[PDB]
Amino acid sequence: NTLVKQLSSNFGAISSVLNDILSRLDPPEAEVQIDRLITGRLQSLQTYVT
Amino acid sequence: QCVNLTTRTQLPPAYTNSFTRGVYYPDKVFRSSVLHSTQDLFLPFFSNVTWFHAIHVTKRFDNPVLPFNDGVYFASTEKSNIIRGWIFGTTLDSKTQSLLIVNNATNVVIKVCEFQFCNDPFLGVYYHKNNKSWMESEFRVYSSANNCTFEYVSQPFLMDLEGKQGNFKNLREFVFKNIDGYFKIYSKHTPINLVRDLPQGFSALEPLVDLPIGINITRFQTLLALHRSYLTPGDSSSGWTAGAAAYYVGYLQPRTFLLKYNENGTITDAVDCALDPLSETKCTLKSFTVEKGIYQTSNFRVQPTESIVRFPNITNLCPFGEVFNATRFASVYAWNRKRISNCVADYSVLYNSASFSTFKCYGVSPTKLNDLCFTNVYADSFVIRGDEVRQIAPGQT
Amino acid sequence: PSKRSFIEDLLFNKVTLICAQKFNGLTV
Amino acid sequence: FELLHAPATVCGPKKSTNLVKNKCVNFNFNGLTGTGVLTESNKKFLPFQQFGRDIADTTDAVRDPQTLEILDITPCSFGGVSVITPGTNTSNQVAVLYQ
Amino acid sequence: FELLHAPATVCGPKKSTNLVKNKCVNFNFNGLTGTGVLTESNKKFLPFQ
Numbered sequence: 001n002t003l004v005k006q007l008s009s010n011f012g013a014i015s016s017v018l019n020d021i022l023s024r025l026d027p028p029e030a031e032v033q034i035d036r037l038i039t040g041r042l043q044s045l046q047t048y049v050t
Numbered sequence: 051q052c053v054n055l056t057t058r059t060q061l062p063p064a065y066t067n068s069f070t071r072g073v074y075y076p077d078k079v080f081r082s083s084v085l086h087s088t089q090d091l092f093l094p095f096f097s098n099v100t101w102f103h104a105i106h107v108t109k110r111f112d113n114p115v116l117p118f119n120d121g122v123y124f125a126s127t128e129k130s131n132i133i134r135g136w137i138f139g140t141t142l143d144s145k146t147q148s149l150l151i152v153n154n155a156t157n158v159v160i161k162v163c164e165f166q167f168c169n170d171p172f173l174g175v176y177y178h179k180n181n182k183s184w185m186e187s188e189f190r191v192y193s194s195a196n197n198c199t200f201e202y203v204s205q206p207f208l209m210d211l212e213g214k215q216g217n218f219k220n221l222r223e224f225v226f227k228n229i230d231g232y233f234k235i236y237s238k239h240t241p242i243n244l245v246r247d248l249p250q251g252f253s254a255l256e257p258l259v260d261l262p263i264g265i266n267i268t269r270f271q272t273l274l275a276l277h278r279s280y281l282t283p284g285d286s287s288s289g290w291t292a293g294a295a296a297y298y299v300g301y302l303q304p305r306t307f308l309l310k311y312n313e314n315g316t317i318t319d320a321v322d323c324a325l326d327p328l329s330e331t332k333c334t335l336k337s338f339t340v341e342k343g344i345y346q347t348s349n350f351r352v353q354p355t356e357s358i359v360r361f362p363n364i365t366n367l368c369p370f371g372e373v374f375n376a377t378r379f380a381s382v383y384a385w386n387r388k389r390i391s392n393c394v395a396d397y398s399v400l401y402n403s404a405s406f407s408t409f410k411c412y413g414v415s416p417t418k419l420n421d422l423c424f425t426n427v428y429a430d431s432f433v434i435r436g437d438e439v440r441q442i443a444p445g446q447t
Numbered sequence: 448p449s450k451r452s453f454i455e456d457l458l459f460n461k462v463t464l465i466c467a468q469k470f471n472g473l474t475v
Numbered sequence: 476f477e478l479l480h481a482p483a484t485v486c487g488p489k490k491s492t493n494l495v496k497n498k499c500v501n502f503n504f505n506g507l508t509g510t511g512v513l514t515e516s517n518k519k520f521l522p523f524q525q526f527g528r529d530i531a532d533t534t535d536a537v538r539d540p541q542t543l544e545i546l547d548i549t550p551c552s553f554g555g556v557s558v559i560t561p562g563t564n565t566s567n568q569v570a571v572l573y574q
Numbered sequence: 575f576e577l578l579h580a581p582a583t584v585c586g587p588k589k590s591t592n593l594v595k596n597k598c599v600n601f602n603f604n605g606l607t608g609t610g611v612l613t614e615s616n617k618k619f620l621p622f623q
Contacts, residue, residue, distance in 0.1 A: 007471070008532045019508045023422050026415040026479075043065075078623040231581060257622055266582030316619060327558050327569045342562045348553030350573060354510055356500040361489045362540040396488045423486035423506035425477040467531050470550060474574065 003044060011040025053191040053286045054167035059109045066101040066248060068093060068107065068300065073307060073320045074225060074236050074255035081311040081385075087323070091121040091227065093303040095322055099300045104274060106292035107215075113170070113274060115142075118267045122226040127218040127242065131211055132295040134173045134232070134275050135159075135191075138226075140268035142167045147199060147265040149233070152273075155186060155211045158204035165192035173275040175211065176284065184211050184372075188276070200263060213277040213293050217245045225239025225255055231264035233253065248298070253319045254256050272297055318329050328421050368393035375404035379431040382438075388429035412444050479507065482525050483540050499551035504537040509548060511520060516545035 008016050013036045015021050021033050072093020088406050118138065126133045135152030142164040149406060174188025225236035236255035272293060279445055282289035310319035323333035331340050332349060380386040380425050398405070409416070414424055440446060450459075469475070483505045499512050505525065516536055520527070527536050536547050555574025595612040 003473075004468070004471070004531050017507075022509065023506070024414045024418050024420070029415070075623075080619045080623050082617075120500060126568045167527075176518055211524055262581045262583055264578075328560065328563075328567060331558060331560060338563075342560075344557065344559050347556050349559060350552045350556045352499055352554075354500045356495065356498065358495060358500060358502055359490060359492045360494075360502065360504050360539060360541060361486060361491050362483055363491065364484075364486070373547050393485065395485065420487040420489060420508065422478065423483045425483075425485070426481045427476040429486060448493065464530065466553070467533075469553060470529065470533075471531070 005049060006041060006044045009040065011036050013037060051193065052171055054302065055170060055172075055290070056287045057109055058111055060112065061110055063103060064101045065098050066298065067418075068095070068097050068099060069221075069248070069250035069424065070095055070252050070320065071125070072225075072247075072255075072302065073252070073309075073317060075119070075257070075317065076309075080315050082139065082313055082315045083307075084311060085308055087303065087306050087308050087309075088108070088146075090296060092305050092307050093123050094122075094305050095325060097300070099298060100408050101298055102296065103290055104295045104297070107294055111269055111292045113172070113289075115269050115271050118228070119301050120227075120304070122270070123223070123300030123302055124219070124226060124272075124297065125223040125248075125291065125300070126295070126297035127244075127248070128220050128222070129216050129218055129294055131209075131220060131222075132212060132275055132293050133222075133275055133297060134212070135182050136226075136270060137167065137171070138267045138270050138271055139167075140266060142269070142271075142408075149265060149267065150192070152191065155209045158208060160202040160204070160261075161195075161198065162200035162265070162309060163195045165195055166264055167192060171273055173273060174286075174290070175213070175275060177213070177277070177279045179280050181281070184213060188278070191273070200261070202261075210281065211275075213275075214281075214290070218242055218294075221249075223253065223255060225302070226270070228265075228267050231262075233261045233263060233265070233267075235259055235261075252318065252320075281381075288443070295307075306333070310338075314360065321350035363390070364394055366393040368395040370400065370403070371389060373429050374400055376431075379433050382432050382434050385430050385432045388431065390427040390429055393428065396420065479505070484487075494542075502548075505540060507534065510552075511548040511550040511573075513546040513548065516547050518545070520545055523568075526574065 010016050012023075013033050015033075016037065018034070018037070019031055025033060074092075076088050076090035102112070102114075104112065124136075126312060134154070135150070137148065137150055139148035140146050144164045146164070147162060148165055148167070150165055152158070171191050174190065175184050176187040177184050192196055219242065221240040221242045223236075223238050223240070225234070227234050227236075235258040237258045238253060238255045240249075240251075240253055259336065277289070277293055278284040278289065279290035281390065282291065306323045307320040308315050309325065312318060319338075321332050321338070322329045324330065332338050334345070334347060346444070349365055365378070373388060397416065411419070414422075434442070451459075476535070486506065494513075496513055496515075497549055501508065501510050503509075504512060507526075515566050518536065520536070525538050525540075526534055529535050534548055538545055539562065557572045558569050558574060560569040586621045593612075598609070598611050600607070601612065
């Protein structure tokens with residue numbers, strides 16, 4: 001249940017849905033928002049396996 | 051212009067199959083006793099390509115215009131080097147930068163000019179009786195040259211270019227690619243001895259010479275040669291002989307192959323990574339020897355087929371006459387609130403009536419406004435001094 | 448009807464979202 | 476303007492297509508896109524409510540703003556690939572096994 | 575002097591120095607810039623790599 005709640009957190013962004021950011025920000029400018037969602041999930045996955 | 055060849059019978063081409071062909075060196079790094087795989091254009095194994103026949107020994111001579119894509123695997127089995135040169139370009143009418151690489155019997159003329167290509171360009175040699183030698187006499191490639199950007203002359207050599215009877219003896223495989231303007235050439239010779247089909251042996255293409263140019267190749271055409279012996283009058287209607295010649299046309303695909311390097315550093319084996327379920331195991335484990343056991347690969351995801359669009363029907367329109375381009379707005383301290391709702395609002399129709407100066411959308415792209423719906427749109431019309439433009443911004447104070 | 452005894456059936460009742468978690472990568 | 480805070484009533488210049496069921500095609504309701512199978516519904520929904528979240532915080536049922544019909548959302552991405560081979564020394568055949 | 579988007583083929587000569595080994599210094603052999611001791615080898619490479 002901990003990994004499920006990680007999909008709703010923004011981790012310092014504006015949206016937690018990958019289908020929502022692409023429909024509002026251009027690719028050359030949305031790279032700063034997608035990286036925050038990928039980095040925020042790598043810590044939860046690394047901690048879960050640990 | 052050139053002459054119009056008559057009595058040309060059209061025959062439906064066949065479809066052959068490649069057997070472990072289209073493997074070259076993706077990088078210039080020497081490897082030995084180590085498996086490596088990168089991302090480069092190669093030819094998939096067991097692929098169906100179009101085989102064009104031009105056997106005349108009849109009356110078969112066709113040279114269509116094929117478009118240049120990502121990697122062109124060209125291979126032909128000539129009985130005595132029948133295929134001469136090739137042409138490259140877009141419109142082929144002395145308008146852009148056309149690439150003319152012709153392989154003659156004395157020098158390989160490689161010039162990058164603006165040649166005027168005719169209708170059906172071809173080559174024609176004559177065979178005399180006193181001296182008995184195949185010399186070039188009918189040159190129908192271009193009419194004149196105007197501007198040029200690159201010129202290269204190869205080393206002088208000795209070649210007769212025979213055109214008598216026999217079977218296939220030589221095999222020259224060329225890989226025409228154009229990545230970021232660089233035109234790479236991969237030539238390799240392989241002695242063969244057959245009459246048709248294609249050898250199923252493994253070969254490795256070696257690079258010839260790289261031309262650091264910057265042209266746009268769109269379409270290409272393979273030029274052949276004709277044989278004018280003493281038995282034929284030599285006319286360009288019925289006294290021409292194309293000879294037993296055939297060329298293969300193959301397009302490279304962005305695939306990944308597992309290159310194998312022995313103690314000498316030569317590629318002698320290649321296994322695909324996305325073709326057969328058995329071939330995906332050796333590429334995943336990075337080992338040609340697979341033991342007994344269960345292994346996991348990728349996942350099974352079903353791709354969608356259609357895409358429906360669902361939006362409520364609105365038969366209204368937002369009044370853009372009183373909001374944009376009016377005659378007088380409110381002040382900076384007493385701004386008027388405009389309620390824009392229950393209407394269709396579009397940003398593209400705001401350029402035919404007025405011209406905007408600084409049109410910037412913060413937090414959302416201007417081209418992504420129609421995809422996402424709007425909720426509670428409020429317009430704040432106010433006229434301020436030009437010195438306050440740099441201050442009104444979500445990030446400036 | 449099963450290949451278990453009465454003691455094994457009593458201990459099974461003492462120790463007591465299926466497809467929703469599998470839609471993210473949680474494969475059991 | 477706000478983003479995703481009230482029933483759709485403004486939006487922009489966008490048309491509409493037909494509705495297909497029992498298919499895993501891409502949908503687009505209230506601007507929010509997604510991918511899933513749209514079938515029948517048997518739950519209860521209030522007239523002033525549009526979206527809906529479960530325990531995983533995912534839109535499982537969105538109301539059609541065109542016909543006011545509740546359609547469930549279920550993606551078909553549910554499977555796996557697993558190849559089992561006895562070995563290259565014996566034969567040259569495998570066994571495609573799905574998860 | 576006019577520069578466009580095409581790859582320029584007219585640059586300029588580069589001053590080449592000498593070759594010294596038996597030391598752990600820095601060297602640059604066409605693109606690759608490594609720092610190590612240059613020793614003799616018995617294997618050969620390819621005439622295009």
